[PDB]
């Protein structure tokens, strides 16, 4: 699809068998989501923007559908104010901006 | 163009006489820039992010260029980590997210 930005690019993800709503963010390096549960070990990340850091566990190889796009990759939880899809996501379902 | 995701969207713009280096950011909903003087009067406002939020001045009826491309909008000047281009910015030079 073709998402114009009037609006907040909004889509509902899969992760875990729930279906949730994120933010296809391409200011975003990583894919951080809000508090919840994922199978595995985990390892400590530090990830930093507006108003400073917070501290996430970073879980790798997550299964995880996009928009009905399906991906596996790193997926960093914590105390984040909105769950955001980032650039390690984004370029396994083929996202690119176009002006 | 067309900007792939393998690295972060950065791009030149010029602002108030100043070329500066900024990120094309889906996940904004407001254009941030660091400090740096504009012309005409401000209003103080909070942004939030990951961290939590940060001070800035509001100005509007601001002109930018993106990467060639010129655009009239508020702009959020404040101790932002990053310049970022958000939505309100990048629907004007016509913007979109495609996969
Ligand atoms: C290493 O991996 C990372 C590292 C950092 C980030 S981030 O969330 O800090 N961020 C990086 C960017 C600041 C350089 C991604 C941004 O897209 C966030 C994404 C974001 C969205 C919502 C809340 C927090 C973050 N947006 C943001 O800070 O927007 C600000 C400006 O406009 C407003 O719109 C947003 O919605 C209203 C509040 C924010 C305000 C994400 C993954
Ligand atoms: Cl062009």
Redesign the pocket.
């Known amino acids: 699809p073709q998402i114009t930005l009037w609006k907040r690019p909004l889509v509902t993800i899969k992760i875990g068998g729930q279906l949730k709503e994120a933010?296809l963010?391409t200011?975003?390096?990583?894919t951080?989501i809000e508090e919840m549960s994922l199978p595995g070990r985990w390892k400590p990340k530090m990830?930093?923007?507006?108003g400073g850091f917070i501290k996430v566990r970073q879980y790798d190889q997550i299964i995880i559908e996009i928009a009905g796009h399906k991906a596996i990759g790193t997926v960093?939880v914590g105390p984040?104010?909105?769950n955001?899809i980032?650039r390690n996501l984004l370029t396994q379902i083929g996202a690119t901006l176009n002006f």
């Open positions: 933010l963010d200011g975003a390096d990583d951080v990830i930093g923007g507006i960093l984040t104010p909105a955001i980032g």
